[PDB]
């Protein structure tokens, strides 16, 4: 429910967070199951608005 | 100019003031764009709200 309230403008902030967490491999495997569940839930909920955006930089981060 | 936005979901456990429901709307003009607003009356999914401003983002009202 907490992630559901989030406006989209913070989701881009949230995705930018996971990107930065990926560099630090220690954190990634320490909290891998949690990062996965939140990440995939953010994408499913507001999928429609995510794809519509044409920002290339967002595309690389998802890459 | 006033925009029309259809609610797609009525957020729950938002801790809003009694009688104010926090909802997520998508604009009819641009179906992709979404914004979170506060509604005063009885609201359900798929009904249309008349937004005077499309810039403000809803905040929890205590």
């Amino acid at each position: 429910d907490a992630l559901m309230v989030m406006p989209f403008s913070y989701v881009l902030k949230f995705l930018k967070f996971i990107d930065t967490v990926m560099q630090n491999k220690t954190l990634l495997h320490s909290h891998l199951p949690l990062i996965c569940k939140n990440l995939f839930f953010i994408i499913k909920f507001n999928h429609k608005e995510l794809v519509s955006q044409k920002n290339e930089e967002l595309k690389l981060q998802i890459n | 100019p006033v925009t029309l936005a259809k609610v797609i979901k009525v957020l729950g456990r938002t801790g809003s003031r009694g009688g104010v429901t926090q909802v997520r709307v998508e604009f009819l003009e641009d179906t992709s764009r979404t914004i979170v607003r506060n509604v005063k009356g009885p609201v359900r999914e798929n009904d249309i709200l008349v937004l005077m401003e499309s810039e403000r983002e809803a905040r929890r009202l205590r």
């Binding site: 559901m4 309230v5 | 938002t14 929890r60």
Partner: peptide, 11 residues
């Protein structure tokens, strides 16, 4: 005080 979701935004 702040609720879940709202704390995450400030974070």
């Amino acid at each position: 005080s702040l609720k879940a979701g709202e704390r995450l935004m400030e974070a």
